[PDB]
PDB file of C-alpha atoms and ligand atoms in Angstrom:
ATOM      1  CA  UNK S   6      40.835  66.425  31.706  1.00  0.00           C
ATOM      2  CA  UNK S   7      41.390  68.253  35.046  1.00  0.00           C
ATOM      3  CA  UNK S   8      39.485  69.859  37.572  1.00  0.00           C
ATOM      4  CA  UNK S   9      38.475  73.340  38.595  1.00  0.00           C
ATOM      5  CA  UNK S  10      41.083  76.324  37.578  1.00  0.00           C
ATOM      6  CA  UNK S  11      39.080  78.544  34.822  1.00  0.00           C
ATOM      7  CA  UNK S  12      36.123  78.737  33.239  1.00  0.00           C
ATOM      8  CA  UNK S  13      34.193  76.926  36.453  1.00  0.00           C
ATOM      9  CA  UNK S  14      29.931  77.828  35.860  1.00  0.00           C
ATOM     10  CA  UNK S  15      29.209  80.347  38.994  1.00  0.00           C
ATOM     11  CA  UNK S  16      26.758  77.462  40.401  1.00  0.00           C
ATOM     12  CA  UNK S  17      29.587  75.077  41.311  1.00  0.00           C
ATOM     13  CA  UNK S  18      31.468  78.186  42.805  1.00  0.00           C
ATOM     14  CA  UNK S  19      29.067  78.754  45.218  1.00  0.00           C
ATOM     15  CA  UNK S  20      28.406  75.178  45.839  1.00  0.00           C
ATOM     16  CA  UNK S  21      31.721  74.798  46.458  1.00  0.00           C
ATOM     17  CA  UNK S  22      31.771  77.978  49.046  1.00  0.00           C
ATOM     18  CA  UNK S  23      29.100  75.432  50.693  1.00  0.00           C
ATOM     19  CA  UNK S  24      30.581  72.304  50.447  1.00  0.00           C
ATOM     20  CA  UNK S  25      32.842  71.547  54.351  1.00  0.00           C
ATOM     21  CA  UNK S  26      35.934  68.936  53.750  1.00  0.00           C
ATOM     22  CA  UNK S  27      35.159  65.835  55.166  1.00  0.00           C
ATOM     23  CA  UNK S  28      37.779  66.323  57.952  1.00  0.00           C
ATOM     24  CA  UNK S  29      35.411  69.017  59.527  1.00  0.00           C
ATOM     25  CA  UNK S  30      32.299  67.087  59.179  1.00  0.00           C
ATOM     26  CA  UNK S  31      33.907  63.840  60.729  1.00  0.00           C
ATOM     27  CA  UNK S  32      34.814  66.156  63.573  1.00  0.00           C
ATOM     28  CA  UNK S  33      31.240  67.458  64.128  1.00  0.00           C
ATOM     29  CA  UNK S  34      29.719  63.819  64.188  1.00  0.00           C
ATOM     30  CA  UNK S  35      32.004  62.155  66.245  1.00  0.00           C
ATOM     31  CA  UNK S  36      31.436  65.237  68.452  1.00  0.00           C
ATOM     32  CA  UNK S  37      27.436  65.195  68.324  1.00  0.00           C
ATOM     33  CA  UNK S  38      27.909  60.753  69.136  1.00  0.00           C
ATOM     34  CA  UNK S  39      30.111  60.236  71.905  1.00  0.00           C
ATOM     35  CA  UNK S  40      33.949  42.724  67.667  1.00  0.00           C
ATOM     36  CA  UNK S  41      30.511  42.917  65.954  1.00  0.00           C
ATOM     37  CA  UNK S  42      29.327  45.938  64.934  1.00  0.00           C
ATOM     38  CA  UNK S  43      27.473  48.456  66.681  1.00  0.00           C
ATOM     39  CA  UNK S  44      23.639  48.559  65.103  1.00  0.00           C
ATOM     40  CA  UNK S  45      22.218  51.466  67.168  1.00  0.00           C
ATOM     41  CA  UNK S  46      25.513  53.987  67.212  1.00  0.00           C
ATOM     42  CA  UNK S  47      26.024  53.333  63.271  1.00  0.00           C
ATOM     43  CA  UNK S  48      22.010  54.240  62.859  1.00  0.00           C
ATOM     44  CA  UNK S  49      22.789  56.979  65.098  1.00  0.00           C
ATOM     45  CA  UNK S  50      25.501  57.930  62.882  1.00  0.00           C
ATOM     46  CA  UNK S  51      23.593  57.782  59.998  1.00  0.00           C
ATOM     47  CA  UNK S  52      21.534  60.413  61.250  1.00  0.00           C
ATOM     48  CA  UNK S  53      23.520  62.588  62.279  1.00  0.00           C
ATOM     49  CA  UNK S  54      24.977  62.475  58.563  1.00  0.00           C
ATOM     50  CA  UNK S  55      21.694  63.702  57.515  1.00  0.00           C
ATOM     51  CA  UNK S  56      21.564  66.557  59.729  1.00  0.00           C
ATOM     52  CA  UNK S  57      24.333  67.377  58.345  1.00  0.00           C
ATOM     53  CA  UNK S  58      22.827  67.103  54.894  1.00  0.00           C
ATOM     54  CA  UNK S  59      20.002  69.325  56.223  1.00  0.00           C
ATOM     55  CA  UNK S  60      22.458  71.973  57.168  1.00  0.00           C
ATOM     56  CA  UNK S  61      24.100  72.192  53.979  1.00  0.00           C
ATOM     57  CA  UNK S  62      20.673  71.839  52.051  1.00  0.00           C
ATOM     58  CA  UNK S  63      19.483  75.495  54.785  1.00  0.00           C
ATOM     59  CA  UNK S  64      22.632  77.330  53.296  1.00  0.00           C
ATOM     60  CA  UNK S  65      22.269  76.638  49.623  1.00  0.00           C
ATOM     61  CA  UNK S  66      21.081  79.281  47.302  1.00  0.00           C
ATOM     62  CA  UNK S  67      17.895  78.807  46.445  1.00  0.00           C
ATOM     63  CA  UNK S  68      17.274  76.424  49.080  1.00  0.00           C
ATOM     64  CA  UNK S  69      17.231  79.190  51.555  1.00  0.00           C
ATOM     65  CA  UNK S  70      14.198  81.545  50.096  1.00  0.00           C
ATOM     66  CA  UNK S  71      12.051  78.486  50.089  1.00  0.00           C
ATOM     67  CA  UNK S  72       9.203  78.246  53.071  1.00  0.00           C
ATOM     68  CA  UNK S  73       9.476  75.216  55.068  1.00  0.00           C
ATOM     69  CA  UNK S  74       7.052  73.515  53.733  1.00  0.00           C
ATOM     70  CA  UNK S  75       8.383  73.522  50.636  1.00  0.00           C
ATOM     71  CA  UNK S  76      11.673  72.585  52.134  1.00  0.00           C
ATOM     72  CA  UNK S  77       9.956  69.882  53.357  1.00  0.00           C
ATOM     73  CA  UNK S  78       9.285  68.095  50.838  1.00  0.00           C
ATOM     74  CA  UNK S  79      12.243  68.584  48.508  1.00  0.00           C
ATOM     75  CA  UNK S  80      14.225  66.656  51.584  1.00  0.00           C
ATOM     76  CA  UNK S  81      11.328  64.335  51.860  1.00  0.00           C
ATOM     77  CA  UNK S  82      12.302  63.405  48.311  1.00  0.00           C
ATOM     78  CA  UNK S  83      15.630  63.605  47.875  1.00  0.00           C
ATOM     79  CA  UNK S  84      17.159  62.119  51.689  1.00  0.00           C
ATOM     80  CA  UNK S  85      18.141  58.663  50.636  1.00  0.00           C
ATOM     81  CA  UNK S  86      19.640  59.368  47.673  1.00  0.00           C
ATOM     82  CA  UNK S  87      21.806  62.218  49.168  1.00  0.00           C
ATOM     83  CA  UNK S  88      22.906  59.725  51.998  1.00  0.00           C
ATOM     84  CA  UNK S  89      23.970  57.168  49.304  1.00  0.00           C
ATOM     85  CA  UNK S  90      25.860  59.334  46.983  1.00  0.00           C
ATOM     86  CA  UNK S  91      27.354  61.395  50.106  1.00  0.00           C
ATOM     87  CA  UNK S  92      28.760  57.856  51.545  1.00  0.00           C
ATOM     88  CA  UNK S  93      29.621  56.464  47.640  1.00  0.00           C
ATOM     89  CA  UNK S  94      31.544  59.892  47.028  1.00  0.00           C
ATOM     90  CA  UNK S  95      33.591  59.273  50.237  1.00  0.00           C
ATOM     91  CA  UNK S  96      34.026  55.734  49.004  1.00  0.00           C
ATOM     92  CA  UNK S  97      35.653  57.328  45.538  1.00  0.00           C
ATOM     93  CA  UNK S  98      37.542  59.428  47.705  1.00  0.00           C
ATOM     94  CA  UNK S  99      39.368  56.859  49.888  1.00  0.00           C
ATOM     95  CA  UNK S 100      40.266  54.903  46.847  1.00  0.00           C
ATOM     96  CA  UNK S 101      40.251  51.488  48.766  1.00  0.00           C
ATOM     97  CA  UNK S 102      38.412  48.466  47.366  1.00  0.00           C
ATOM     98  CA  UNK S 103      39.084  46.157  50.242  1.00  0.00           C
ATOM     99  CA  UNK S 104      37.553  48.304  52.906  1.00  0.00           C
ATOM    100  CA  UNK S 105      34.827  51.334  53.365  1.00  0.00           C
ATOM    101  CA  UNK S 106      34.880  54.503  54.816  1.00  0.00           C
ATOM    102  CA  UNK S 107      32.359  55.538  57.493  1.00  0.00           C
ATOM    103  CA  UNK S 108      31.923  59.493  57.888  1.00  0.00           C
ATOM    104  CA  UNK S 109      33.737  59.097  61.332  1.00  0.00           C
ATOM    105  CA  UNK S 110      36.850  58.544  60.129  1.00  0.00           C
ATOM    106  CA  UNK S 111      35.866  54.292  60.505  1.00  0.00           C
ATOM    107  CA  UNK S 112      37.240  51.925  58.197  1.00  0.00           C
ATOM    108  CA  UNK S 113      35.628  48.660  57.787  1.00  0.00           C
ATOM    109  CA  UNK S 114      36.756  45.882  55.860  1.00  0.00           C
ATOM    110  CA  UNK S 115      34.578  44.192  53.452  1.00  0.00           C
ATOM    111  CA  UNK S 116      35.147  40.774  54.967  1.00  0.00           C
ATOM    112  CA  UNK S 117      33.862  41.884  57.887  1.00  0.00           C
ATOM    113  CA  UNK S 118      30.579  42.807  56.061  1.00  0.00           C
ATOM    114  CA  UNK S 119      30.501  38.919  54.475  1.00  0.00           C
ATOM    115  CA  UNK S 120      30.565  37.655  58.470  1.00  0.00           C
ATOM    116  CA  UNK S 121      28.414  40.313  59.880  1.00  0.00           C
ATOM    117  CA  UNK S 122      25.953  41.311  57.231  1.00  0.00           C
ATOM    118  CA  UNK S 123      22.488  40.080  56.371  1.00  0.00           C
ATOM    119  CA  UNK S 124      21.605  39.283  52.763  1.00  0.00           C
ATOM    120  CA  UNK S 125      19.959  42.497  52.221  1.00  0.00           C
ATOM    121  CA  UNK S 126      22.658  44.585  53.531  1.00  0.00           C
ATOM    122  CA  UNK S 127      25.689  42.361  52.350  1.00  0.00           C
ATOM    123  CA  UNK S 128      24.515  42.859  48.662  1.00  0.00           C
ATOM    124  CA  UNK S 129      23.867  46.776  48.647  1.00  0.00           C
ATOM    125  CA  UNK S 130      27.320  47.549  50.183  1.00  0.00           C
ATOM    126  CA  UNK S 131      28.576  45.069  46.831  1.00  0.00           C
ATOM    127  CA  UNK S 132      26.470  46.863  44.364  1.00  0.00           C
ATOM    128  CA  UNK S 133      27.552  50.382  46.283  1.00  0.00           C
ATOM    129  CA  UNK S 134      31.067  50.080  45.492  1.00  0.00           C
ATOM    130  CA  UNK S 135      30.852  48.657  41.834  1.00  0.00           C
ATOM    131  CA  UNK S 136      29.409  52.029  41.122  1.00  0.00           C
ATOM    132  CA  UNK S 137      31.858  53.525  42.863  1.00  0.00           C
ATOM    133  CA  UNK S 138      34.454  51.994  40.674  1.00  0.00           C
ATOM    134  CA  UNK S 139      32.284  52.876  37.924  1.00  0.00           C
ATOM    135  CA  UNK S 140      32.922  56.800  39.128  1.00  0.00           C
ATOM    136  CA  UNK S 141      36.493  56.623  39.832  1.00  0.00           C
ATOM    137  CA  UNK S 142      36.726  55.185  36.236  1.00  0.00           C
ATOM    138  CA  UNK S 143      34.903  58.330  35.096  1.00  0.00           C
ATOM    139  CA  UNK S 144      37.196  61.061  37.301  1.00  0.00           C
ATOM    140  CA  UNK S 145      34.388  62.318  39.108  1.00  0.00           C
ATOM    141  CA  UNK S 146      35.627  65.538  40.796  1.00  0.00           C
ATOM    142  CA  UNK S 147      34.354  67.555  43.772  1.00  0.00           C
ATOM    143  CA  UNK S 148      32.936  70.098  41.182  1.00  0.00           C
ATOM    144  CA  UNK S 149      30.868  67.995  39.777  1.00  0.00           C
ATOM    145  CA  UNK S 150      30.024  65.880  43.293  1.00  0.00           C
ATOM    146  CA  UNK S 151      28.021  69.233  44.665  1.00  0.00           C
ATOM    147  CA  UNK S 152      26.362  69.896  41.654  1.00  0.00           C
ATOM    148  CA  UNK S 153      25.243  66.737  41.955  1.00  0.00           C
ATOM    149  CA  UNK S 154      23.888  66.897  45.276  1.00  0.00           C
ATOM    150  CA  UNK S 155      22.136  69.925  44.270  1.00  0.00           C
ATOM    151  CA  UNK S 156      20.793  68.513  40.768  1.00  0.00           C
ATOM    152  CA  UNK S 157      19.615  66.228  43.672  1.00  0.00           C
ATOM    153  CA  UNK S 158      18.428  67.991  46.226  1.00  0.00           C
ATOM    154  CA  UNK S 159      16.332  70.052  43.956  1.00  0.00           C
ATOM    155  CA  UNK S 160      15.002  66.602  41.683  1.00  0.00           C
ATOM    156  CA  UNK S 161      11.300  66.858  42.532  1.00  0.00           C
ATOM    157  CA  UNK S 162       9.021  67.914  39.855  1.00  0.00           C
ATOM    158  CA  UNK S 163       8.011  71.183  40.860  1.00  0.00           C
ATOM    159  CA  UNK S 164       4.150  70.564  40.557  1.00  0.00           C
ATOM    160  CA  UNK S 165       4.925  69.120  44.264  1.00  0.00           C
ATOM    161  CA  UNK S 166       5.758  72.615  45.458  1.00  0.00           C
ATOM    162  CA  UNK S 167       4.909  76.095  45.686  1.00  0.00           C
ATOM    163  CA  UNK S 168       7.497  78.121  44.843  1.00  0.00           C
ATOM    164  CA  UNK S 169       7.613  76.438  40.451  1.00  0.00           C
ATOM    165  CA  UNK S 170       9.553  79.346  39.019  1.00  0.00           C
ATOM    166  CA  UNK S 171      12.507  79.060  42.106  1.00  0.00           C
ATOM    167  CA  UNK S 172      13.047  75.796  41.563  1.00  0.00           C
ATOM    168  CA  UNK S 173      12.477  75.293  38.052  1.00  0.00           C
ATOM    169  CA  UNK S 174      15.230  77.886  38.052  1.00  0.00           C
ATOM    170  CA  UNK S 175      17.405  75.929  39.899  1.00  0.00           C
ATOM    171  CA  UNK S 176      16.813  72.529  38.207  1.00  0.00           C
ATOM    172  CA  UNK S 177      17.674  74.459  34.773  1.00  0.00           C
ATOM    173  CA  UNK S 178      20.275  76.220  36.163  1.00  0.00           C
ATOM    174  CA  UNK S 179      22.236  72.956  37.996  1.00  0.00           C
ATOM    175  CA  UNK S 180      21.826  71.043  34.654  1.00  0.00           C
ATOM    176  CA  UNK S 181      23.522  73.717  32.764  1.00  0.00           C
ATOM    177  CA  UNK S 182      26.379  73.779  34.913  1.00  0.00           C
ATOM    178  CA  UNK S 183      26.950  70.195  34.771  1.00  0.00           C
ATOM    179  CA  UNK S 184      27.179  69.832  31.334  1.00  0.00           C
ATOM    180  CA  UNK S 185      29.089  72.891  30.672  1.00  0.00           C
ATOM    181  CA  UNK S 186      31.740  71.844  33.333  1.00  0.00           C
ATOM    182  CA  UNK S 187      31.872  68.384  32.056  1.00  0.00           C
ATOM    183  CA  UNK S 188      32.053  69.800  28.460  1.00  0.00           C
ATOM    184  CA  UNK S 189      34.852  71.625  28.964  1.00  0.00           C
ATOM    185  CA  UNK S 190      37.100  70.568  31.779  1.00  0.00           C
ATOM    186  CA  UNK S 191      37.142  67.046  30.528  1.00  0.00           C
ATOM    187  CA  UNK S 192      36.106  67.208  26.552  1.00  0.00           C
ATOM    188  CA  UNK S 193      37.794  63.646  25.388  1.00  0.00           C
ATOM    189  CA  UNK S 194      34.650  62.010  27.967  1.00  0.00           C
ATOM    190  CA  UNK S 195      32.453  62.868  25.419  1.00  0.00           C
ATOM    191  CA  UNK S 196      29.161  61.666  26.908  1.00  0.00           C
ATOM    192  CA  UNK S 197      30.291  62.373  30.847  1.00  0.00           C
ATOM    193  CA  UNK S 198      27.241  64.675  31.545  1.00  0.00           C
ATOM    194  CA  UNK S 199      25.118  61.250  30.464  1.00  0.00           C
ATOM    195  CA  UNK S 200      27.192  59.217  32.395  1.00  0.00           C
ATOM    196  CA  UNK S 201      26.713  60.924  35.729  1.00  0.00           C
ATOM    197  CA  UNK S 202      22.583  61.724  35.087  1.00  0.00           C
ATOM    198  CA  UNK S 203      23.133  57.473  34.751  1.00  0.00           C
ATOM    199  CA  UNK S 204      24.940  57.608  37.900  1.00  0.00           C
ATOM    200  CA  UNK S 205      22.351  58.948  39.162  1.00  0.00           C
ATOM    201  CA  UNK S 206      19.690  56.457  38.152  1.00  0.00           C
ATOM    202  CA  UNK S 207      21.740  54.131  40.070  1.00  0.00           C
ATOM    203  CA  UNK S 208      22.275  56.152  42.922  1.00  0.00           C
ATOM    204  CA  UNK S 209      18.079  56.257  42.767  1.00  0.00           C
ATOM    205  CA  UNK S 210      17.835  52.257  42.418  1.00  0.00           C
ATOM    206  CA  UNK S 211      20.320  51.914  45.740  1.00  0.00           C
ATOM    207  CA  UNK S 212      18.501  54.206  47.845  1.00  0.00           C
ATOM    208  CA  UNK S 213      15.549  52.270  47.229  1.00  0.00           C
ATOM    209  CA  UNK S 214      17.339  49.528  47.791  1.00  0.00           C
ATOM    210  CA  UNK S 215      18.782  50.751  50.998  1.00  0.00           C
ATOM    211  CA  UNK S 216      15.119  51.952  51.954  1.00  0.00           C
ATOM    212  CA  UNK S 217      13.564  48.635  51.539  1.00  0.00           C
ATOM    213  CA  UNK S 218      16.570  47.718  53.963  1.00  0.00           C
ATOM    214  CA  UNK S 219      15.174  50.151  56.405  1.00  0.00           C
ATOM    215  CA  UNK S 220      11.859  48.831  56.172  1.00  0.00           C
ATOM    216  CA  UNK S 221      12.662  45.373  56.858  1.00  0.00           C
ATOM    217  CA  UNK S 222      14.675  46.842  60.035  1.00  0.00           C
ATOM    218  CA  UNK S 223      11.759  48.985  61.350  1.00  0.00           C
ATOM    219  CA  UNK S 224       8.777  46.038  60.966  1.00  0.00           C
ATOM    220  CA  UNK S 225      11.584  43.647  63.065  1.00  0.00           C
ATOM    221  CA  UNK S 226      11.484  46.221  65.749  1.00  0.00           C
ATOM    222  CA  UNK S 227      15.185  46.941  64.928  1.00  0.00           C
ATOM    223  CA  UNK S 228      15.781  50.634  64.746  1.00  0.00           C
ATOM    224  CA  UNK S 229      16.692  52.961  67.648  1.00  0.00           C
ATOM    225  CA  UNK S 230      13.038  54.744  68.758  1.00  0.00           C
ATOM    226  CA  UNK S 231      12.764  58.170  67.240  1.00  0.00           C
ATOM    227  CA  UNK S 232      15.539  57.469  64.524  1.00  0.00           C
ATOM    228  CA  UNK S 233      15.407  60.504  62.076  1.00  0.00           C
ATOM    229  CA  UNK S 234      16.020  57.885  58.924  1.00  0.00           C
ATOM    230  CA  UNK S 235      12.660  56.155  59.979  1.00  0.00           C
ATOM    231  CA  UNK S 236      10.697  59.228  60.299  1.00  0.00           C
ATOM    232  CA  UNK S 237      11.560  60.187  56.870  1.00  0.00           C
ATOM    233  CA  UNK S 238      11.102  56.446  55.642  1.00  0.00           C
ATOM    234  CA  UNK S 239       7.776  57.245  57.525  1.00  0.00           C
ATOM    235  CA  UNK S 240       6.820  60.581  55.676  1.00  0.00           C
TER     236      UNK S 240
ATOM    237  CA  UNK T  11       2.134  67.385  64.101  1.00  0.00           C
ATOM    238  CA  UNK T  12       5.927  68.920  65.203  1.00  0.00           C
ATOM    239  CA  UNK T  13       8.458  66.311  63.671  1.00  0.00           C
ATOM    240  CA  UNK T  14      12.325  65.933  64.146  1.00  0.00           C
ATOM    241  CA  UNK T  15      12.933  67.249  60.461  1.00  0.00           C
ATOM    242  CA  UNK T  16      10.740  70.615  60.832  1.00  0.00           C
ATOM    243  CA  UNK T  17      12.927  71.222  64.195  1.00  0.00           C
ATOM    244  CA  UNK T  18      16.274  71.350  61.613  1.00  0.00           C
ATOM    245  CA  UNK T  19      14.648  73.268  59.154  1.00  0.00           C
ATOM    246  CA  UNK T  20      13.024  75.978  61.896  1.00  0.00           C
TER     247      UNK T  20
HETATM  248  C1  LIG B 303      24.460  52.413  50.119  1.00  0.00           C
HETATM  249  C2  LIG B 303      25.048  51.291  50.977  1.00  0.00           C
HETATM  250  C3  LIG B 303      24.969  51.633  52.466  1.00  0.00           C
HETATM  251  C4  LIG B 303      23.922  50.829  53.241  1.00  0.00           C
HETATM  252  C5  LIG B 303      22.704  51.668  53.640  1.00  0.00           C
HETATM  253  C6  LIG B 303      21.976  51.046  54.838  1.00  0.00           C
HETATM  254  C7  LIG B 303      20.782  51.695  55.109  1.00  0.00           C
HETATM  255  C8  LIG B 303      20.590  52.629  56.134  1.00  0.00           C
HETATM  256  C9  LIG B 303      21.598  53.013  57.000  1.00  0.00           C
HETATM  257  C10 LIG B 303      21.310  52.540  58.426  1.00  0.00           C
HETATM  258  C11 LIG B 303      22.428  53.029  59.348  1.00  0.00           C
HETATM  259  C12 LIG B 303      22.892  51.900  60.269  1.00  0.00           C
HETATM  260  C13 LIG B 303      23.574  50.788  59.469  1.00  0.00           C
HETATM  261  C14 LIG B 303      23.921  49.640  60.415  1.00  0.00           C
HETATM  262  C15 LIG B 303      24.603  48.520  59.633  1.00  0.00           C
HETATM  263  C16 LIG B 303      24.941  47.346  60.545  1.00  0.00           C
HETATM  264  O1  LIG B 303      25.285  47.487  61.725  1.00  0.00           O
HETATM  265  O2  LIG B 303      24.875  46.148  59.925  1.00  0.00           O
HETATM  266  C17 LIG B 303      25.142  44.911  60.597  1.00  0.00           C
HETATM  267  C18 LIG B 303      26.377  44.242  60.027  1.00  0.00           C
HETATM  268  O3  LIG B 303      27.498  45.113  60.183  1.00  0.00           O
HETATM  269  C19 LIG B 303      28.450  44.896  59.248  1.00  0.00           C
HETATM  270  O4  LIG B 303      28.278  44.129  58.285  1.00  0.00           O
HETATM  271  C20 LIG B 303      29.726  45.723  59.365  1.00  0.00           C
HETATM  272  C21 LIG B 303      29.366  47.205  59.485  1.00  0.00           C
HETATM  273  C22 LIG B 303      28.770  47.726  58.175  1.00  0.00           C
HETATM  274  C23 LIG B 303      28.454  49.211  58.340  1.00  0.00           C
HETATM  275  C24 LIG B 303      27.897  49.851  57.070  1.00  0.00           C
HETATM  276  C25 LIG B 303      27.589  51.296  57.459  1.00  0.00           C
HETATM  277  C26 LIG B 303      27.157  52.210  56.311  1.00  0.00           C
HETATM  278  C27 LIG B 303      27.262  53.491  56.842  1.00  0.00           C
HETATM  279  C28 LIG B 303      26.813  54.671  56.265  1.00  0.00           C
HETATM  280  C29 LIG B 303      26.170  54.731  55.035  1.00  0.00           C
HETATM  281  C30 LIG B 303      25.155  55.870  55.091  1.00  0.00           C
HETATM  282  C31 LIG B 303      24.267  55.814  53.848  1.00  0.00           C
HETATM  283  C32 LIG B 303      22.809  55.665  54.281  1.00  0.00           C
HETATM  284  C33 LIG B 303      21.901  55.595  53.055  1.00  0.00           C
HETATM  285  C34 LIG B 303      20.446  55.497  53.502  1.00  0.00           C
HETATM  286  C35 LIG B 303      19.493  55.495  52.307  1.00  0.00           C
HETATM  287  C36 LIG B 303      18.087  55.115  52.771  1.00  0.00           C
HETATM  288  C37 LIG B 303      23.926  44.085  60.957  1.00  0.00           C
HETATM  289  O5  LIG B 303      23.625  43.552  59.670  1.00  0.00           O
HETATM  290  P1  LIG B 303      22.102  43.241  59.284  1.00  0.00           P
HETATM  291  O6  LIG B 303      21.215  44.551  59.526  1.00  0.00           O
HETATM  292  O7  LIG B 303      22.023  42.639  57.950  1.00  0.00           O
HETATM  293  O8  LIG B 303      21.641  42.221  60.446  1.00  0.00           O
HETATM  294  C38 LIG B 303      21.973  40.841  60.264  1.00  0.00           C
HETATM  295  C39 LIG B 303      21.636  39.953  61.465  1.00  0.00           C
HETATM  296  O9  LIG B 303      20.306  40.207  61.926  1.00  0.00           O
HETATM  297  C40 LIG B 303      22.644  40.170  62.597  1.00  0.00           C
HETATM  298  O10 LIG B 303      22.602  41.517  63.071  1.00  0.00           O
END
């Protein structure tokens, strides 16, 4: 199989028109921020990975001829679970299984998680990168990364919004293009358009995961006041 | 009831 060159679906074109390298966007959040590790600055970090998430998710086709309240409440469902499969995709990126990769450019070894780490905590990171093993096994590419954030992005049932046609559009539309770029940039993975919508389940059962994390962080008095991951926890 | 997320989004 191999990635991009022809026959790409026009979705994951434009996604990928969207889509900054991770060089710029480590740039912008070490901008917008400045032994054990620091709690507050990686929650702050955290955050500002999400506004990042929101910025992409205001430029996106589609996206941007929704009113905000619709907006609203497609982020309101779909925040963790971009967070987790922006951070695993970096993880399949840096091709390390000793160590992660924090958006700013960060690496931290996974010892250092055993010392530091909570239960709660120690075991996501663990069941975080055995799926992303389980992606670099499949060759996930960048072309199918965004359309995953977009298949995403747009995963609420559309009963939950105003606009149905738009995104029922959309949701067809980004399902399409997954399985006809799967289909025919990597045709001897037979079932890869299944494996990634499983992917996704698991990308689902970790942000829950990471969520109930949260939760446990916010009743202990724990998070920084007015942290954006808590007011969407919250929502 | 303004909120951080309808700040981004305006
Ligand atoms: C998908 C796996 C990622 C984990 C998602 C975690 C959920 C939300 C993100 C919150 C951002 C801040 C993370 C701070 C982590 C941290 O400092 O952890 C420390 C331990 O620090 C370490 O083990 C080394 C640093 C580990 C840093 C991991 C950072 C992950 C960074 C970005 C991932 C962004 C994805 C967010 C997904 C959110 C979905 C809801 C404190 O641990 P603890 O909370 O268990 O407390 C134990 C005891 O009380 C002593 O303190």
């Amino acid at each position: 199989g191999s990635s991009g060159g022809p026959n790409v679906p026009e979705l994951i074109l434009q996604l990928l028109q969207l889509e900054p390298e991770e060089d710029q966007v480590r740039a912008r959040i070490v901008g917008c921020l400045q032994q054990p590790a620091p709690f507050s600055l990686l929650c702050r970090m955290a955050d500002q990975t999400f506004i990042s998430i929101v910025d992409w998710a205001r430029r996106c086709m589609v996206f941007k001829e929704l009113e905000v309240a619709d907006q609203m409440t497609l982020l309101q469902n779909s925040w963790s679970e971009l967070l987790v499969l922006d951070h695993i995709y970096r993880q399949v990126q840096y091709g390390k299984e000793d160590s992660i990769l924090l958006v700013t450019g960060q690496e931290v070894e996974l010892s250092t998680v055993a010392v530091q780490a909570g239960s709660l905590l120690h075991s996501l990171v663990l069941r975080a990168q055995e799926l992303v093993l389980q992606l670099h096994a499949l060759q996930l590419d960048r072309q199918e990364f965004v359309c995953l954030k977009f298949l995403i992005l747009f995963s609420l049932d559309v009963k939950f919004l105003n606009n149905h046609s738009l995104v029922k559009d959309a949701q067809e539309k980004a399902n399409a293009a997954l399985l006809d770029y799967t289909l025919s940039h990597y045709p001897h993975s037979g079932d890869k358009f299944q494996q990634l919508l499983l992917s996704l389940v698991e990308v689902r059962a970790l942000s829950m995961q990471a969520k109930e994390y949260l939760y446990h962080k916010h009743l202990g008095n724990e998070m920084p006041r007015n942290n954006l991951l808590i007011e969407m926890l919250q929502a | 009831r303004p909120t951080i997320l309808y700040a981004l989004l305006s």
